[PDB]
From Swiss-Prot, chain A:
Sumoylation regulates its subcellular location. Sumoylation at Lys-19 is required for interaction with TBL1X. Desumoylation by SENP1 leads to relocation from the mitochondria to the nucleus. Ubiquitinated at the C-terminus by SIAH2; leading to its degradation by the proteasome. It is found in: Nucleus; Mitochondrion; Cytoplasm, Cytosol. Induction: Down-regulated in liposarcoma. Down-regulated in macrophages of patients with adipose tissue inflammation and type-2 diabetes. It comes from Homo sapiens (Human). Transmembrane segments: none annotated. This is G protein pathway suppressor 2. The gene is GPS2. The chain holds residues 53 to 90 of 327 of the full protein. Key regulator of inflammation, lipid metabolism and mitochondrion homeostasis that acts by inhibiting the activity of the ubiquitin-conjugating enzyme UBE2N/Ubc13, thereby inhibiting 'Lys-63'-linked ubiquitination. In the nucleus, can both acts as a corepressor and coactivator of transcription, depending on the context. Acts as a transcription coactivator in adipocytes by promoting the recruitment of PPARG to promoters: acts by inhibiting the activity of the ubiquitin-conjugating enzyme UBE2N/Ubc13, leading to stabilization of KDM4A and subsequent histone H3 'Lys-9' (H3K9) demethylation. There is a cross-link at residue 19 (Glycyl lysine isopeptide (Lys-Gly) (interchain with G-Cter in SUMO1)).
């Protein structure tokens, strides 16, 4: 069909937004390490 | 531990760093709206 080339570019931007979820979860894990010593 | 106070101050500095990385994801999520709204338009 048509109007699909624009959907392929959106899939690349979603990969950068999905990586932020792993970077945001790793930040909360760092503070959790302080609790072990708190 | 150390003094139940110097280690407590380190936990407040780590919480401020998570707000900066979390603020970047909120601005990137809104940017997806413009790209998702422009790709859905005819």
């Amino acid at each position: 069909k048509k109007e699909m080339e624009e959907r392929m570019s959106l899939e690349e931007t979603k990969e950068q937004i999905l990586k932020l979820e792993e970077k945001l979860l790793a930040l909360q894990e760092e503070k959790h390490q302080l609790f072990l010593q708190l | 531990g150390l003094s139940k106070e110097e280690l407590i101050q380190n936990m407040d500095r780590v919480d401020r760093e998570i707000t900066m990385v979390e603020q970047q994801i909120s601005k990137l999520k809104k940017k997806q709206q413009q790209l998702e709204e422009e790709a859905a338009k005819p």
